[PDB]
Amino acid sequence: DSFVIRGNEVSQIAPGQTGNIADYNYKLPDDFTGCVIAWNSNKLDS
């Protein structure tokens, strides 16, 4: 799953943690297993 989010949400995408877009569009599982990666794509959209 690939999307772009802001820097202050990187700590919101975590197993068992609540947020908004991972709660209002698609949601992560409590038993999730995998990994997440983050790129600072500031010069893409600003």
Added chain:
Amino acid sequence: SALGKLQDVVNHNAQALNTLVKQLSSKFGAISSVLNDILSRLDPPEAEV
């Protein structure tokens, strides 16, 4: 105390069950003894442990 033995059998069984049921109240280290509260005031990930 002529009937000590039979009386003793009865008492042992009664006491065993009593302690078994009473031990449900112990917390064993958990934050509470009733499961409902455990599952109420805590998120599922921590309620597991």
